Amino acid sequence: NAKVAVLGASGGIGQPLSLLLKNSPLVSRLTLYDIAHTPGVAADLSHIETKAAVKGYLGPEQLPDCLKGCDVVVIPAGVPRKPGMTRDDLFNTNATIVATLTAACAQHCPEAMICVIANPVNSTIPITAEVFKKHGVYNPNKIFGVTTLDIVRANTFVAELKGLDPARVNVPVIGGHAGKTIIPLISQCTPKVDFPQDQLTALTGRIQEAGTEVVKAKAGAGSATLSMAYAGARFVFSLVDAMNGKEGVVECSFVKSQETECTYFSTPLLLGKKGIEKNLGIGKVSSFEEKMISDAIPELKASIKKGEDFVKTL
Amino acid sequence: NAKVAVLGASGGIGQPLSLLLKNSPLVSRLTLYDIAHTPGVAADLSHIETKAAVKGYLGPEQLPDCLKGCDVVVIPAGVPRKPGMTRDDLFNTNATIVATLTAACAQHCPEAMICVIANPVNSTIPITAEVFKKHGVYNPNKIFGVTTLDIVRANTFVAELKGLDPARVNVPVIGGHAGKTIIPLISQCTPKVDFPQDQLTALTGRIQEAGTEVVKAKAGAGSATLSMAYAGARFVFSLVDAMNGKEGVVECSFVKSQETECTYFSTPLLLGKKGIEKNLGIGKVSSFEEKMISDAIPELKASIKKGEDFVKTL
Amino acid sequence: NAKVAVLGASGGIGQPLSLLLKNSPLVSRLTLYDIAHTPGVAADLSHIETKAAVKGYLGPEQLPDCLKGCDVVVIPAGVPRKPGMTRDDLFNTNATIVATLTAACAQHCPEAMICVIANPVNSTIPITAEVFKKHGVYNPNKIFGVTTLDIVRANTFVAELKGLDPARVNVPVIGGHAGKTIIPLISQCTPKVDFPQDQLTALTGRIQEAGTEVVKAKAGAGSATLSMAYAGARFVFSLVDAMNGKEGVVECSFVKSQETECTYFSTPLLLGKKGIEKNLGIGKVSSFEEKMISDAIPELKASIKKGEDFVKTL
Amino acid sequence: NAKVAVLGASGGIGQPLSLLLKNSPLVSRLTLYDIAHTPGVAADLSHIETKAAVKGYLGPEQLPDCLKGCDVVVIPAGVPRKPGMTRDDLFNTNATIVATLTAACAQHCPEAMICVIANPVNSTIPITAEVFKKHGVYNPNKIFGVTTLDIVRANTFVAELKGLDPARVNVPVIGGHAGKTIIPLISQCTPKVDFPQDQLTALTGRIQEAGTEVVKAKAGAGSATLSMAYAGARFVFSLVDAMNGKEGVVECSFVKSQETECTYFSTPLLLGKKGIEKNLGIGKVSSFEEKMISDAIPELKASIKKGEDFVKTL
Numbered sequence A, B, C, D: 001n002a003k004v005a006v007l008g009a010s011g012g013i014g015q016p017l018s019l020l021l022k023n024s025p026l027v028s029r030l031t032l033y034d035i036a037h038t039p040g041v042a043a044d045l046s047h048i049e050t051k052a053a054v055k056g057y058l059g060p061e062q063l064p065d066c067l068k069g070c071d072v073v074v075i076p077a078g079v080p081r082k083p084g085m086t087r088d089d090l091f092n093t094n095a096t097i098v099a100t101l102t103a104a105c106a107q108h109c110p111e112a113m114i115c116v117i118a119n120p121v122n123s124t125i126p127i128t129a130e131v132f133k134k135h136g137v138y139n140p141n142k143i144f145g146v147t148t149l150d151i152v153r154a155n156t157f158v159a160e161l162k163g164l165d166p167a168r169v170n171v172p173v174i175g176g177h178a179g180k181t182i183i184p185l186i187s188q189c190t191p192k193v194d195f196p197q198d199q200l201t202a203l204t205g206r207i208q209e210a211g212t213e214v215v216k217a218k219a220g221a222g223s224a225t226l227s228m229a230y231a232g233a234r235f236v237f238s239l240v241d242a243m244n245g246k247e248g249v250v251e252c253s254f255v256k257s258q259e260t261e262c263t264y265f266s267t268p269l270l271l272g273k274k275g276i277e278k279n280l281g282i283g284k285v286s287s288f289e290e291k292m293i294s295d296a297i298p299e300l301k302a303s304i305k306k307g308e309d310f311v312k313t314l
Ligand SMILES: NC(=O)c1ccc[n+]([C@@H]2O[C@H](COP(=O)([O-])OP(=O)(O)OC[C@H]3O[C@@H](n4cnc5c(N)ncnc54)[C@H](O)[C@@H]3O)[C@@H](O)[C@H]2O)c1
Pocket: A007, A008, A009, A010, A011, A012, A013, A014, A033, A034, A035, A036, A076, A077, A078, A079, A080, A081, A090, A094, A097, A116, A117, A118, A119, A120, A121, A146, A147, A148, A149, A150, A177, A222, A223, A224, A225, A228
């Protein structure tokens, strides 16, 4: 029954993400939007033997037709990192992209769940919320910064070191999605795992800089796309199941938060029919994890304020 | 715990195909090969929280290490069509690519299931077979021209016309993978469907030209990639299920055949632990379908000889 | 003075060709046409400190505006070779592109000089001529297959071997533009040069296979672009100079001919105000060269017929 | 004659720049360097009928061989802007690229003229100087930030508005190559021109944002390439002419300067056999122009410090 729009469907993330959505029985209609190539991408995907009806839309003229009646909107639309850059370096391009696309969402599908993949997530969620406020349809239970890839990485790396099946592993990751703002709560990992402090520090750093590690590995050919398609699909599926009344669906996501000093913050969230059913908070943490939370807050606030400031200028 | 190799893993089909394989609990090891970008694609995929060990390989020296111990090899390696071109127009580039890569398979994983995606399939499978013969390891029950996208398309188009769930539709498609050699056996469709003639003729033509319609829709930006990834993955999973002893696994594929005077031909195949368990043949068809088979034969034989001749000039 | 349209201006040849045209004092108006990116290319070029006014057009709806009042139309529009392919392998894509674009020329600027770059030149010129005939505006003095790169290459290769300045060297090249149809008349080279037959044979083959050499050096990243822009520019400048009344302007070009049994053939042409002033013919040649001409005719006639037959099916 | 190296020769600027350099009688040896595609680009260019010997080099191992014996080195190597970005947003990628490539220059052709195209020029020239200083081979007369495109643009826009031939317009542009630091001295334009203030501010705005204008018009497909190749070629030709003793050659360029409080600044430079013969200074300007200079200092200083501070962390 779910109608899902992918804004930026023709890109590195957008195409495999759209493939995973098309493959799912949770999706009945898939609308694809981009400024280039969408008709070809949609034609391609429309041949797949699943029930989701696929349609491609090209350029701002066809954006309203893409968004009409949407339950979920996922937004990988943006520009990726080159080696050396921070996610923040992308602000001046993606801020405008996110502001433009979310403005269309506020106008044409204000009740949809808005899932922002476009970086820097720490600032693009603040932008999304302010754009919705300006249009008078701000619902903080329906706006999500997709940080799922951090959790997915943490699970993989913990499983590698301990020789576990990654599907059996769950590591809560909190804070935001940039360098030190990525805080993996290894103390809260299921199953219980014990690492020496030096291993834990390297593991923590490995998780924090994993995006940069992939950017380096690609050597100028973009950033994480396939693993991000996986994580984005995972988050959308969790959300859609929750919207269909499945109980106990928990995902971490960068959202409007009162858990800390920061106006936006990522914690585990009980999802449901209203979107965010309950923010489960940070919970019990180690001293090591407590310090990381403290050290990250200054950056998060700066990133939050930057996105808010940007929206003032429009 | 299938070990799967993808040759051409950095390309348009290769990347989404590798994602789908990595996502599957049927795969324990995923080895990726290409002439460029493999390390970045593998790094990307290795972060996904599934059990499959991913490694990327790059350049001639590393190709043997990518292939050793594989149960299945998929080869999308090759150049794609531009609008106007036939798949046959790709021959003079892709013949050498398929010959080289299948020679490496014959040397380093002769017992694997060889799944050729590279076009024109009607000639590249004969190439593959002749290359394996030269190395004295030709097993016709383990070499497959992947025609699965034709069936996937037929299922979707039949489902759309009748208002059915395409998950429940299964259309046998026989012959080859080029224009008029693609013969959808609508008379053998399950569930049985009765179409008025004008719909049946349009349906048949749509299935035959589907690849060209995607090429035209992409306007120079390649051919079907996401739906081909889906179809390739489906075929590998069918192969793996059969290898694990699942009974009644049937797929159409362009293989060594005695069904017609064409030495290679696509029919439904019962798959087993050693590849093709039993060629189920053409079966009973309509007069319309019989005519299409007769009309397909001259082209198929020409594409076959073309592939064979190429190997004899080396 | 001259108004020049470039059809396929966003491509590998198109962009640098357009750069060289924009840089020229012979050009006062430069219209650029493609199916993508033309606006950005024109904006780029419009900033250059020369008099030529640049305008970019996008899509068939805008093709008449681009063509109106043109003195010369250059057509690099098409698709390039990958390693292994012949120029003839491009036929099925480029035949339709050339037929479509030259039909628009016939309608909107029938008086213009039509310079065809798109391959295979041995077929695309016949196609161009037949399209103009169907519109009833055929002028054999104004339709040119651009072979100029063959002359340029011959000049360079002869100059390297004799330690000469390639600017001082002129080698007539006749026949067509593919494989052994490329016939460099080394016996007519100015300055006079002597090679023993073994060197001459090697030099001749190098000139013939030079296009394939570049395709293979680019390893899938296209064919000759920059040197073709140079050759394309040179031919257009010769044509405009001749149109401005300059005397003794001679260029080889594949055109409607009666110098052989081939209805199209490349020989040195004296250019004038109305296009071809006089075909200077083959002239006196060696037995080596005479033999090459005789052996080339069957391929040329087959390529010519193929182009003619294509237009008959429109 | 001049031995010129192009570092980043396979890119959007690099290829047509190399074409222009190959076409010139001033160049005797053209060495092309990149991390990809150079052998194909060199093959392509080597067929052009001019005397310049063209060689391609690939990967940091061959970089010393590309630089040895060079008189001039031009460096477009780097990443370009996407719409919305400033040139400074490129710093965290391009800084390391320039530092690496200029370190190789300092090691292998310390006596050569170094022309940096890579952005942001306001920081990358300071990086080049400090890198040369670290190797003890700093010569401020030989290091040039290519701002030439600003002058070319100014000339075109002035000529447009005043119905002049842009080839005989000369507008000095001073300061730097980023937004408000681009300061066109319309008061010093030859021939003399006068605009109403509202027009002059519009003209000045146009020149300053001209780079963004092209970036936006290309809509994600890169930045100015063809006009930059023209501008880079012009500057190299001016520089090579002056090295051959041609007199009266003047170009604006971002260089080590003491005309203002900024350590680096762009002013008209008389070029000579040793590089900079004389810095011709800012000269007499209007109060409008003086205000802009004053407004630009803080930004210029910041960009300079950024570049300097980067090299101090190596
Ligand atoms: N949330 C995460 O953990 C996470 C992970 C990976 C990547 N990302 C971010 O996702 C974004 C997309 O990355 P990618 O690899 O797909 O880049 P990409 O360039 O491959 O694809 C981006 C797509 O966005 C489209 N687009 C750009 N502007 C648009 C517009 N104004 N309207 C419609 N479409 C537009 C482009 O045309 C392109 O098709 C980047 O900002 C990247 O940093 C986030």
